[PDB]
Design a protein around this ligand. Structure first.
Ligand SMILES: Nc1ncnc2c1ncn2[C@@H]1O[C@H](COP(=O)(O)OP(=O)(O)OP(=O)(O)O)[C@@H](O)[C@H]1O
Ligand SMILES: [Mg+2]
Lengths: 630, 55, 109
């Protein structure tokens, strides 16, 4: 059997957002910053909903990368307040709040945002004056721009601030002259057309699906898969690591999906994630004796009721035979009068009752009464012994039938098996409503198994009911048997179809998760084919953009994401179009690197807003520039 | 041979038919008479059609 | 116990509340109800117009297993792959069909 042949399963421990070590204030960064030439130093903050990434413009990578979360609480034992603002929170008490509105790119809890920024400036080593470059959501809300500016200029007093878009910084860092920028991030997916290094933000589109939504959706699907119960505490922080580690984009979803749960090869399509389970004769002899006596008592009680039914049925039988002894040679009125004493109405009803009692009985001062009761048991024993005689010789006759008419005898077993299955079907398909054989079926199928070379176990009724012929076992537990007793085989989830079903929401949002928005290929194709050729200032559209479709943000890092997008776009473009899909180098940090390289250029310093310009114009005002919002 | 993407009139009668395959799209200017052949076949947008453009 | 003392020592080392932020302006204080939701912020409009719908026909998937679904149940309104999953779907507990709809973001309440 396959589960006996298959190797032991390979299993992956659950991963979650966890603290690992402290990091001190990085005073060498402050030292290096004070050493830079005038107007060539800035603090660069990539304000990401998954990670805030921060560092110095003159360095090649962030010094900090922390979730935009705070935890603040009063210790009920020690009696003092504690406060935390990143991965310093163990994501020990997880009183967590998040700066962003859940599943969106917009900051809305400004108290968390200040705590996150306090942690940033502390760990960058600021103690008392530095220009700030901060990334911003596409089409970011003016109220959030205002609130962020107020914090930067009036809480922290910074000399100058500029906002730009993480998608576009990533593009310019990778030599983006002109192209279609495709960003899938934690919060969102965007397609932005970029022309002559300037983004055409009036033509940008947002999907409202991203790496957060995939973690939440993977969580819903797992809580549905194991809806009858799962012992581990399923958190979307865990399903995020499952989506990172195990999910991939299909190159032909319907053909890969339709075969995914087929038992052959599911061993290699499944992946198994295991939660931290706990491993759990005089005693037994005495208890078993008490059980054995209790069972014996139940057996005696059944036999005592059976013996009461034996004596009752034999006494009933004797009475009905006493009628028959009269009825033979007596009138219909005597027949009717004796039947009326039974309140029966037919001699053959007495025959049926006489036989049916015998058919039941065969299965199962004082001395004259006691022995005549024992003689009713001897009348029962005569039915019981005649039953024994009947069965022994009838079986020997059938053994001759097997020897003498083997093929017809096999053909009989088929005809009987079907007829018995028909009665079971006539029972069950009806009783499935009307409720509001089996050993005979087996015995027939057993001889068919024994000697009918046309028969197989796969047609056995039990095989129709077997777990390894089911689909939901493959879905929930894969190629291998399952028992709830094993603490190691409980506490594990089998990902199966969700390996591919979760990434495919980007391509099929309404069909898979009901998002009611166009898929990624349809968004990009609407821009390339319908919009940009209509926009009158543009030249060489679409073709100039097709030469660089560019992938950015962590939620693009799925395997086959590029080739899926290429093959999807290839069918929407005219034949021989020079379509190139390209990945960013290091598609997460690369948006910060773009902001850092841009930070002190003349283009950036023309776009900087000073504290005094902020006091003049207010916090909604922005210098419009290639990499930022209008 | 492709999925019909477009069937647009371009004459007072000449169509443009757009055809699509998994590997790209092409547009064909149709002679008024092969257009009627395509119209006698019950072709619509989203149908898959075969055309011998020479014959 | 030393483990608990070391744990509190680590939590004390991690604590921001013990730190005076010398770079903060001590004078400025926010409006304590600045934390408006996106819904509330858009309520000030009386540019997040970047969302897009679709008109292509929608493929049908099984609500239980995600496999392709030929069938839509009249009763539960769940889509399902085969007779085995139809048997499951009509044997669901009293609130569970609505949870399968909620993964599509469908509701009947
Ligand atoms: N190798 C990977 N494969 C797939 N997904 C990944 C991988 N690494 C990270 N992710 C996911 O991608 C997302 C990270 O996106 P990214 O950090 O680029 O965005 P962000 O700047 O935090 O977000 P936003 O711009 O929406 O505010 C998370 O959902 C993360 O789980
Ligand atoms: Mg981002």
């Amino acid at each position: 059997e396959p589960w006996k042949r298959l190797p032991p399963p390979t299993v992956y421990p659950v991963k979650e957002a966890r603290f690992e070590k402290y990091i001190p204030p990085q005073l060498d960064g402050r030292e290096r910053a004070l050493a830079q030439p005038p107007g060539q130093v800035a603090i660069v903050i990539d304000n990401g909903s998954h990670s805030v990434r921060a560092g110095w413009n003159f360095e090649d990578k962030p010094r900090l990368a922390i979730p935009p979360i705070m935890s603040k609480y009063r210790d009920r034992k020690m009696g003092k307040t504690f406060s935390f603002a990143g991965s310093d929170c163990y994501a020990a008490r997880s009183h967590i709040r998040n700066a962003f509105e859940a599943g969106t790119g917009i900051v809305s809890n400004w108290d968390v945002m200040e705590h996150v920024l306090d942690y940033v400036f502390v760990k960058l080593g600021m103690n008392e004056d530095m220009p700030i470059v901060m990334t911003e959501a596409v089409a970011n809300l003016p109220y959030s721009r205002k609130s962020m500016s107020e914090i930067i200029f009036e809480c922290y007093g910074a000399p100058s601030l500029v906002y730009g878009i993480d998608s576009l910084f990533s593009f310019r860092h990778n030599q983006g002259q002109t192209g279609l920028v495709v960003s899938s991030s934690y919060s969102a997916t965007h397609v932005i057309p970029v022309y002559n290094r300037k983004a055409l933000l009036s033509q940008a589109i947002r999907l409202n699906w991203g790496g957060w939504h995939m973690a939440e959706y993977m969580l819903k699907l797992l809580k549905l898969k194991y809806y009858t119960g799962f012992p581990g505490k399923l958190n979307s922080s865990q399903t995020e690591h499952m989506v990172r580690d195990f999910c991939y984009v299909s190159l032909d979803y319907d053909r890969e999906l339709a075969g995914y749960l087929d038992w052959t090869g599911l061993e290699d399509r499944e992946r198994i994630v295991q939660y931290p389970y706990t491993e759990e004769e005089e005693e037994l002899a005495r208890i078993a004796e008490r059980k054995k006596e209790s069972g014996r008592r139940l057996q005696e009680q059944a036999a005592k009721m059976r013996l009461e039914r034996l004596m009752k049925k034999e006494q009933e039988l004797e009475y009905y035979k006493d009628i028959q002894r009269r009825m033979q040679g007596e009138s219909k009125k005597e027949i009717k009068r004796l039947l009326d004493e039974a309140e029966l109405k037919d001699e053959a009803a007495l025959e049926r009752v006489i036989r049916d009692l015998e058919r039941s009985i065969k299965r199962a001062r004082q001395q004259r009464l006691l022995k005549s009761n024992w003689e009713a048991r001897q009348r029962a024993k005569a039915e019981k012994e005649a039953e024994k005689a009947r069965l022994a010789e009838e079986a020997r006759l059938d053994e001759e039938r097997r020897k003498n008419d083997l093929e017809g005898w096999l053909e009989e077993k088929r005809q009987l098996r079907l007829a018995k299955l028909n009665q079971l079907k006539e029972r069950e398909r009806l009783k499935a409503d009307l409720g509001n054989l089996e050993a005979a079926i087996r015995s027939l199928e057993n001889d068919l198994l024994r000697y009918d070379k046309t028969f197989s176990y796969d047609m056995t009724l039990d095989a129709q009911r077997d777990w390894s012929k089911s689909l939901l076992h493959a879905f929930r537990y894969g190629p291998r048997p399952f028992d709830p007793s094993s603490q190691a085989e409980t506490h594990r989830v089998h990902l199966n179809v969700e390996r591919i079903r979760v990434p495919e929401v980007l391509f099929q949002p309404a069909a898979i998760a009901g998002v009611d928005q166009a898929g990624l290929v349809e968004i990009a194709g609407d821009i390339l084919c319908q919009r940009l050729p209509s926009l009158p200032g543009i030249q060489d559209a679409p073709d100039a953009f097709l030469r660089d479709v560019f992938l950015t943000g962590g939620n693009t890092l799925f395997q086959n994401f590029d080739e899926r997008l290429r093959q999807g776009l290839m069918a929407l473009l005219p034949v021989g179009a020079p379509l190139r899909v390209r990945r960013a180098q290091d598609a997460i940090l690369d948006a910060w690197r773009g902001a850092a390289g841009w930070a002190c250029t003349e283009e950036a310093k023309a776009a900087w807003i000073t504290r005094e310009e902020y006091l003049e114009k207010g916090g909604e005002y922005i210098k419009e520039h290639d990499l930022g919002n209008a | 041979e492709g999925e019909v993407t477009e069937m647009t009139p371009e004459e007072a009668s000449t169509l443009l038919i757009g055809l699509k395959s998994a590997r790209g799209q092409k547009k064909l200017r149709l002679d008024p008479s092969i257009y009627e052949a395509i119209q006698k076949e019950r072709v619509q947008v989203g149908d898959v059609i075969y055309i011998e453009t020479n014959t | 116990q030393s483990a608990q003392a070391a744990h509190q020592a680590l939590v004390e080392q991690l604590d921001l509340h013990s730190i005076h932020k010398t770079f903060r302006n001590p004078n400025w204080r926010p409006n304590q109800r600045r934390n408006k939701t996106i819904k509330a912020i858009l309520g000030e409009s009386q540019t997040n117009i970047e969302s897009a719908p679709s008109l292509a026909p929608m493929k049908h998937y099984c609500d239980v297993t995600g496999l392709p679904a030929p069938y839509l149940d009249p009763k539960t309104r769940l889509r399902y792959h085969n007779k085995e999953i139809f048997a499951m779907i009509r044997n669901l507990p009293q609130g569970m069909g609505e949870q399968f709809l909620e993964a599509r973001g469908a509701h009947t309440v």
